[model samples]
Target: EVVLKFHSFPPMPANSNAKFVKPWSEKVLAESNGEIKVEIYPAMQLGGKPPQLVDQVRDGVVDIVWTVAGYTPGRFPHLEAFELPFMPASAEATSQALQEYVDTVAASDLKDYKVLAVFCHAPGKIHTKEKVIKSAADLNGMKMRGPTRVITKMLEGLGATPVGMPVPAVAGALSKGVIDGMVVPWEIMPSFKLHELTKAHTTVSGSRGLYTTPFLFLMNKAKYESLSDEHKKVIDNNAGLALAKLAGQLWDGFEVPARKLALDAGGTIHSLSGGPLAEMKAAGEGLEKDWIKSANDRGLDGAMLVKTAKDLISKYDK
Candidate 1:
């Protein structure tokens, strides 16, 4: 039998580990008919921090890993197109688009590793410990944990100090007053028990959610190459667009239950709209411009990549 080890940063209950990685591994095992087995290590049980998971997989320290693409800024600039402000509306659709985007534009960017799938969480929103974010002005001087550099830039533009850390560290950070709020999806709130600490949620209205973090399920290239054709076929069948869709659907499904928990806790739900939303959007424009320049520096046509991503989004959104 062929055995593979899968490591994930989030605890086993979170969708990254539970909803996606767990089932995908099981499906591979069942489909392989006892010829292949996958053992999962969640909450970084295998060792190392969240940001180091990808490199561990790349270096063959682990056989496989599931991690956020944005955790290391500038590492995957093309994927950042989906992370742009107001870009993703439906996690399922956008995730499919992400697969196509990688297939066409960014595949070479991941030449060192074998990417099993690429997907994203539902749109992210602001959850604060005690502050009510009624306007952009309220964000001034607030220290918030941002999921990505693009997100941190947008947060900085909105007048908040952006703190960068993995999701597992957020609750502790919030408790210690290291950050006042965080930009995350409601679906992740319960997994991290964030609702118990945050009293306010600022959801973006009349547009796509603030932003989404793109996730990657990857395997060490050498390990993937070493698999026999039969085992590889089984892995392939359970990955790619198939895996991305499953991930998106499961994560988006968690939104309702997670939001209900926050509401049940008497958390104040707020919205950003009209004037304030427009201003935040305006501030976010510069970040896109900066992304375009960075992409150009890397010999990529940033404008074309952005257009292709938007077109794919339109196709799936329909």
Candidate 2:
């Protein structure tokens, strides 16, 4: 029997499990006719923090993990393409773009694990316990938790003090005032209990998303190798771009429900329009320039990769 253990940093019904891990687990088990069994330990029940997840998988601490690539910056530079500012607004496009990017270009970097899928969430913006952010100027000096390296830069660019921490730590950080705010999509608000800690959500209207983070679902090498060819093929049928879209839409599914919860909790949501949003997009472009140049220095075709990612998302979005 091939038993696979999947660990993640969120609850079982959260977007990751509902969309990717749970479905993948069931498929693998059914396909292998119970020969392959998957045990899921969400919210890091297995021991170890989010930052340690990649190393844990590489070292065989867990058979698999669904973790954010941006959790450990510089560890996977090529995948940083998805972490940049103002790229994805709809989770579907974002998820599809990451999948296409990995299948064609970033696959080499992820050779360590049998990559189950690469996906992303919708454009993330600010939610604060105090004051609505109507403009970039509004975020000045407020301590905000940043989800990824690129988001840290975005917070810094907007004049906020960026606090780097795992997502699970966010609720406590906000309650304690360690951070005045956090940057995340509306979909995830319920899990973090942001409605309890904060009262305002700042979003940029239209296609220009302020920023986002990329996530991965990967299996251990040995576990995958131990599977029969038939079992592996079954997994493959449910892996890659089609599955990525399911994960994306599932993530996007959280958006409305989470936002409604916050609203019912008496939070104010603001969508930036016109000139202020343009300014935000401009700052995002500045960051992208620096990131792409750094990618070139690392011997990657940064421009081509971004272009291809955008093209793929556009092609699949319809």
Candidate 3:
């Protein structure tokens, strides 16, 4: 009997739990004819902090983990291509593009585990407990939590003090005033109780998103290797872009429900335009230049990778 332990950091109410993890688990069990059992532990119920998820899966502490690749920046640098500022906004498109990028370009960096899928969320918005941000100038010296290396640097460049931490710590950070604000998609607002903590959400209304983070749906190597041939085929069938699209579709569908959490809480949503939006967009271009240079240093054609990712997302968005 094969029992796979699947883990994640978001709580039970989050779509990562109910929509993505649960469905995948049910499918694995049903398709395997009960030969395989997937035990789920959401919100890190198994043990350890959110940042340890990748390590947990890699070291076989857990058989499966759904974790943000940005949790440990520089560990998987190539995955950051789709995460760059003002990238595509469709979660399903970006998710599929990222999975393909991994399958074709960056698999070696992820040799520690059997990658089930690589996906992304919609473009994130800035949420602040106080001091609603309407312009790039509004962020001056404000402490903000950024999810990825590129984002933190971008935040700093745009005149905010960037606080780096995993999402699980965000609620507490806001409540304690350790950060004045943070960025995340509306779909993620209810999961960490952000609507309860923050009164304002700042968004850029455009096809290109301000920023997004990539995720890893990973399985332990030895755990995968131990599975029988038939069981492995079942996993393979459910893995890759198919699983990634499920994650993307669910996140996209939950956007309205989660955004309503803010409205229900009497919060304000700010959509930037004019000068402020342009300033932010211009700043993002600098990050891309930097990332391309960094990628080149890593023996990669960062510009080509970015173009391919954008093209892939465009192809799948329809």
Candidate 4:
């Protein structure tokens, strides 16, 4: 029997951990016929901060970890293409596309670890305490917290002051006036009790969301290589695209309930429209242009990556 220790940065009850990872782990155990045993430690239970997770996994501090790609800026420049605004129309389609990208273009970027799966959360919305942001202009000078470097750049381009921090620090930051608002999906609001802290939520109208964060389920390379071939097959069957699709589907499923939580709390939800929406899209285009240049500087074919990702998204979107 093989015992694998899984560590996550989010709390135990977070949707990704409870709704996705837990069930997925069970499925692997059943598939392996009890030859594989997974012990999950949530909320950084094994030790280390969110930013340190990827390195920890590479160093074998944890057997497995599920974490956000944006946590470490500039480390995975090619991955940023998926995170651009108006890119991912739905989590399901985008997640499937990401799996394909990882297998092909991003193989070298993630060569350090044995990547189990690659997925993303739903596009995050702007949740604020006092202001109701109706358009891009309204965000001017507001201190907004964003999850990743790309999103923070988007926020900055839109004229807002962008602050970077892990999700666990958001509520406290909001309460202490460290930030005026934050960008996060509704699925995480209840887990962080954000509904209680913020009274206004701004959503991007139409198909695409403001931004999304790419996440990964990775295992230490040595640890994975040490597994017996039979056990490795069990992990492979349950990982990759299979896991990505499931996680994406679960995240999309949570959107409705998450939205309901905010509404039930009597919070107001605003959608961007008219000139402001157009401006937001234009800003997104500018960010893409800048990212392409950055990616090229890093010796990656940014244009090719973007085209491939879009084509893949189209393939799965059907």
Candidate 5:
């Protein structure tokens, strides 16, 4: 029998772990005829911090992990493409695009282990404590926790001061005044009570999103290699694009409740439109170009990767 350990950063009740990980575990057990057992550990219960999860999985300190790839920026430059500005449509569709990208062009960057799935949450909105975010100028001097280094760079370019850290740190940072705001999905706000601490949410409306954070479901290479072909086949059958889509669907559903929670608490919600939207987009344009240059510097076809991700998003978005 094969017993796999699954580690996650959020609590078990949180959407990703509860809505997907738990059921995925059940499905694996049943499909394997009870020959494969999955033990779930959420909120970093197994030990270490969120950023350590991917390394833990790679080192066999954990058999499996669901983590944000940006938690360890520059380590996965290719996968970082999806995190760039205006790149995401919806979690489900964009995730499928990422799965396809990984299967092909990004393969070399992810040679360490088997990637079960790759995806993103809904596009992030600017949630601030005292800032209404009416214009790009309003962001000047605002200290915001950016989910990744690339994102932090965009924050810096767009006139805001970027503070880099994992999601878990945002809550304390907010309370301590270390950060004035954050760019995060509505679905994740309640998990950290960010809605309670923030005064406003600024969103961009369009087919594309301002930015999205990338996530990975990964397995240890040695552990996976030791499995019988029959077991390996089961794992393959359950993951990749298929699993990525499922995760997106679940995440998409989580946005409403948290969004409402913020509204009901009297936190204002703002949408960028008309001239302001265009200004915001134009301001963010350099970040995309910067990404292409940086990706190329690392020996990748940066423009091609960006083009491929955008094309795949259009293909999968329904």
Candidate 6:
């Protein structure tokens, strides 16, 4: 029997693995006739943080890993383009787009591993510890934890002190006053308890995600190569575009409950409107342009990729 291990960062139920990972494993096991057995490690019980997940799989420390690619910026710059603001308007739409984008573009980013699936989460918003932010001008000197570098830049551009860290760290960071707020989806609010830690959530009144994050379900190359042709087929059949969408939907689906928790906790939720929302959307547009430029620098058709991704999202949305 071939035994493989999968590592994830989120605690039980809150993580995507809580929903999709077991289903994925069960499917593979059943299809492969138990030739492949998967052992899942959640909450980083094995060792290491979320950012080290990809490397751990690459280094053979783990047979498989599920993590957010944005956890390590610049390392996967091409893939990082997907993490830019406004690129993902909602998790369901963007997750489908992400699968299609991976199928059509950014193939180089996953060359190092046997990719299981590549996807992204839904729109992100600011959950603050104090005061509603009606405009960029409202941010003046506040500090917030930015999930990705582009988000960090966006926050800095708005004159907020941007603290860069993984989502798992955000809770502690807020509790310790390391940051005044965090950027995340409403679905995870209860898990991180940003609702209890903070008093407000500021969402963009638009389709594009405030700042998206890319997630990966990766398997070790040698382990995958060792599988019999039929077993490999099982992995491939459920992997790629098929699994990307499945995983993304699971990730994006969490936001609804998470958002409700914040509301239940008495934290005010505000959607920026009119001139202020448009200004934020414009910044997101600029970030998308910058992403395309960077993709071209790497010899990829950034615009084409973005176009395809957007088109795919529209297709799935319907």
**Model 1: which ten-residue window has the lowest total lDDT?**
15-24
List of clashing residue pairs for candidate 2: none
User: Residue 93 in model 1: shift from native, Å?
Assistant: 1.2
Report the Cα RMSD per candidate. 1.3, 1.5, 1.4, 1.1, 1.2, 2.1
Residues 2-73 of candidate 6 have per-residue lDDT tens digits of: 899988888766656666788888998998888789998889988988888989998788998888787887
TM-scores of the models, in the order given: 0.96, 0.95, 0.96, 0.97, 0.97, 0.92
- lDDT for model 4 comes to 0.87
Note the Cα lDDT for every prediction shown.
0.86, 0.83, 0.86, 0.87, 0.88, 0.79
Estimate candidate 6's alpha-carbon lDDT, on a 0 to 1 scale. Answer: 0.79
Give the Å shift of residue 160 in candidate 4. 0.4
Of candidates 6 and 2, the better by TM-score? 2
TM-score of 5: 0.97
lDDT of 1 by residue, 163-281 (tens): 98888899999999899999999988888899999989998897477888798889999999999998889988988887787777887897888999999998988888899889888
Query: Residue by residue across 20-75, what tens digits does model 4's lDDT show?
Result: 87888899899989888889998988888998889988998888888988899988
Off by over 4 Å in 5: none
Indicate which candidate wins on lDDT: 5
Summarize candidate 2's per-residue lDDT along 185-230 as a digit string, tens digits. 8877777677878898888888657777888888778777877788
C-alpha displacement of 56 in model 6, angstroms? 1.3
lDDT of 3 by residue, 1-318 (tens): 788888889888788878888888889889999888999899889999888999999999999999889888788978888878788668888888888889987777698889899898888888888677888888998999988787888787677899988887888998888999998888877877888898988888768778889989999999999999999999999998888887788777878888887889988888888888899989888888999999999988898989988888888887
Those runs of model 3 whose alpha carbons end farther than 4 Å from true positions after fitting are none
Candidate 4: segments with Cα more than 4 A from true spot: none
Clashes of each: 0, 0, 0, 0, 0, 6
Q: Model 6 compared with the native: what TM-score?
A: 0.92
Which clashing pairs does model 4 show? none
